[PDB]
Design an enzyme around this catalytic site. Structure first.
Site, short mmCIF file in Angstrom:
data_model
loop_
_atom_site.label_atom_id
_atom_site.label_comp_id
_atom_site.label_asym_id
_atom_site.label_seq_id
_atom_site.Cartn_x
_atom_site.Cartn_y
_atom_site.Cartn_z
CB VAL A 26 -1.03 0.02 1.16
CG1 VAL A 26 -2.09 -1.04 0.93
CG2 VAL A 26 -0.37 -0.17 2.50
N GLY A 27 2.15 1.17 -0.12
CA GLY A 27 3.04 2.33 -0.10
C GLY A 27 4.34 2.04 0.64
N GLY A 29 8.47 3.80 1.54
CA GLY A 29 9.41 4.90 1.47
C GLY A 29 10.64 4.71 2.34
CE1 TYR A 31 10.81 7.82 10.45
CE2 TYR A 31 11.90 9.06 8.70
CZ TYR A 31 11.51 8.94 10.02
OH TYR A 31 11.83 9.95 10.91
CB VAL A 34 2.64 0.18 5.00
CG1 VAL A 34 1.19 -0.13 5.56
CG2 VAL A 34 3.40 1.05 6.00
CG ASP A 161 4.08 10.99 12.18
OD1 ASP A 161 4.43 10.92 10.97
OD2 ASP A 161 4.58 11.91 12.89
C1 LIG Z 1 -4.21 2.49 3.51
O1 LIG Z 1 -2.91 2.97 3.83
C2 LIG Z 1 -2.42 2.86 5.14
C3 LIG Z 1 -3.15 2.48 6.28
C4 LIG Z 1 -2.57 2.40 7.54
N1 LIG Z 1 -3.35 2.02 8.54
C5 LIG Z 1 -2.79 1.94 9.74
N2 LIG Z 1 -1.51 2.21 10.02
C6 LIG Z 1 -0.74 2.61 9.00
N3 LIG Z 1 0.61 2.93 9.27
C7 LIG Z 1 1.29 2.67 10.47
C8 LIG Z 1 1.76 3.73 11.25
C9 LIG Z 1 2.50 3.46 12.42
N4 LIG Z 1 2.97 4.54 13.20
C10 LIG Z 1 2.31 5.75 13.40
O2 LIG Z 1 1.20 6.04 12.90
C11 LIG Z 1 2.98 6.73 14.33
C12 LIG Z 1 4.37 6.84 14.57
C13 LIG Z 1 4.79 7.80 15.50
N5 LIG Z 1 3.92 8.61 16.19
C14 LIG Z 1 2.59 8.48 15.99
N6 LIG Z 1 1.69 9.29 16.72
C15 LIG Z 1 2.13 10.63 17.21
C16 LIG Z 1 1.08 11.26 18.19
O3 LIG Z 1 -0.25 11.01 17.74
C17 LIG Z 1 -0.40 9.58 17.65
C18 LIG Z 1 0.28 9.17 16.37
C19 LIG Z 1 2.11 7.53 15.06
C20 LIG Z 1 2.72 2.14 12.79
C21 LIG Z 1 2.26 1.10 12.02
C22 LIG Z 1 1.54 1.32 10.86
C23 LIG Z 1 1.10 0.08 10.09
C24 LIG Z 1 -1.20 2.72 7.70
C25 LIG Z 1 -0.44 3.13 6.58
C26 LIG Z 1 -1.07 3.19 5.30
O4 LIG Z 1 -0.46 3.56 4.14
C27 LIG Z 1 0.85 4.12 4.29
C28 LIG Z 1 1.42 4.57 2.92
N7 LIG Z 1 0.44 5.28 2.08
C29 LIG Z 1 0.67 5.36 0.63
C30 LIG Z 1 -0.64 6.02 0.21
C31 LIG Z 1 -0.71 7.15 1.24
C32 LIG Z 1 0.06 6.65 2.47
#
Ligand SMILES: COc1cc2ncnc(Nc3cc(NC(=O)c4ccnc(N5CCOCC5)c4)ccc3C)c2cc1OCCN1CCCC1
EC number: 2.7.11.24
Length: 334
Positions: A26-27, A29, A31, A34, A161
């Site tokens: 799904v994407g 980069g 870091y 996913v 994030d």
């Molecule tokens: C459909 O595309 C998706 C769906 C997702 N669903 C659920 N999770 C993720 N990604 C994800 C993120 C994280 N970490 C964090 O979100 C994170 C890190 C640090 N700090 C925070 N905080 C700070 C304070 O507020 C709370 C949040 C959060 C851990 C695990 C996962 C799996 C996704 C990702 C996703 O797509 C990602 C790429 N995509 C390409 C198209 C647009 C983006």
């Protein structure tokens, strides 16, 4: 110790428990990559992130430990939470890969657009509710912007994030380091987000740090004597007084035809002085959110220990602390 299966996609080995099935990219980069997946233990649809070379340097290792600590502590309806964390390493010696599992978000705020006044109320309400929670544990987001906000079909929102220029949403005191800051750098961002939903356009679309300030000062006005007194840097003070003195605009003549209680909240959010800016908690109690506010269902977080942040450790020490955190992980109840 569950059964793992291997498999390759996007040019990278994924080694995950059999629990997680039907993986689809799904994407990716710099870091981590996913994948979406089906979770055969809850019938729920999840997202799995493989960290990119989590222990390559001191910066990566500390950052890896920071994300894992943070996600393990967050338990709130408007904040992303950790369903599971796993490694295919049997020992600390062979420990080199980290995988994080959360609920699968669909579309972000960026994607879902103008929109109704009732919709803005509910969306901004949920962000502030989530901000009250993280700010109470001294956690600051720092990169709040529409593409870091998940919104499903029910209009339910979660702060996350994924890691729209960031600068468009940044507090002027952080952007320039011109005055001390607090949690309310994120409150600045929310005001920029709310404006955008009210009018369909980015409020301040700058093309660098200087142009961004210019656009901002055009709306809020040049700092007054009271605020100029607290600017610590001499350079920054000069620049500001060397500018041409802009006046404060009347927000009703800018957000023309919008709900007057939202115009009022915008004014309490987009103030330059960060001692004066409204907090998340005070903002939940404003009259804009009367139809949603319940002071008995707007909880705060448990104390969060972030002393690790001052430590200077070697890679193997951060790696070992991470491993501990993997092993002590207990899943949340269904
Ligand atoms: C459909 O595309 C998706 C769906 C997702 N669903 C659920 N999770 C993720 N990604 C994800 C993120 C994280 N970490 C964090 O979100 C994170 C890190 C640090 N700090 C925070 N905080 C700070 C304070 O507020 C709370 C949040 C959060 C851990 C695990 C996962 C799996 C996704 C990702 C996703 O797509 C990602 C790429 N995509 C390409 C198209 C647009 C983006």
């Amino acid at each position: 110790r569950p059964t793992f299966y291997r498999q390759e996609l996007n040019k990278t080995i994924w080694e995950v428990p059999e629990r997680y099935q039907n993986l689809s990219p799904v994407g990716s980069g710099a870091y981590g990559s996913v994948c979406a997946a089906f979770d055969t233990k809850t019938g729920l649809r999840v997202a799995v992130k493989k960290l990119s070379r989590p222990f390559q340097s001191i910066i990566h290792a500390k950052r890896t430990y920071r994300e894992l600590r943070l996600l393990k502590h967050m338990k709130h309806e408007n904040v992303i939470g950790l369903l599971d964390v796993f490694t295919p390493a049997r020992s600390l010696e062979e420990f080199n890969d980290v995988y994080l599992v959360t609920h699968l978000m669909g579309a972000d705020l960026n994607n879902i657009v103008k929109l109704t006044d009732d919709h803005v109320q509910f969306l901004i309400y949920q962000i502030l509710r989530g901000l009250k929670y993280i700010h109470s544990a001294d956690i600051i987001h720092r990169d709040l912007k529409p593409s870091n906000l998940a919104v499903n079909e029910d209009c339910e929102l979660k702060i996350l994030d994924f890691g729209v220029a960031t600068r468009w949403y940044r507090a002027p005191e952080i952007m320039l380091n011109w005055m001390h800051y607090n949690q309310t750098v994120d409150i600045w961002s929310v005001g920029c987000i709310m404006a955008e939903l009210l009018t369909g356009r980015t409020l301040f679309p700058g093309t660098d740090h200087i142009d961004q300030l210019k656009l901002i000062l055009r709306l809020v006005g040049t700092p007054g004597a009271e605020l100029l007194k607290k600017i610590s840097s001499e350079s920054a003070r000069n620049y500001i007084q060397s500018l041409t003195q802009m006046p404060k605009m009347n927000f009703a003549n800018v957000f023309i035809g919008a709900n007057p209680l939202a115009v009022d909240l915008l004014e309490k959010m987009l103030v330059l002085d960060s001692d004066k800016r409204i907090t998340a908690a005070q903002a939940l109690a404003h009259a804009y959110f009367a139809q949603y506010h319940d002071p008995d269902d707007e909880p705060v977080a448990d104390p969060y220990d972030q002393s690790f942040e001052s430590r200077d450790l070697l890679i193997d020490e951060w790696k070992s602390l991470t491993y501990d955190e993997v092993i002590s992980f207990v899943p949340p109840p269904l």
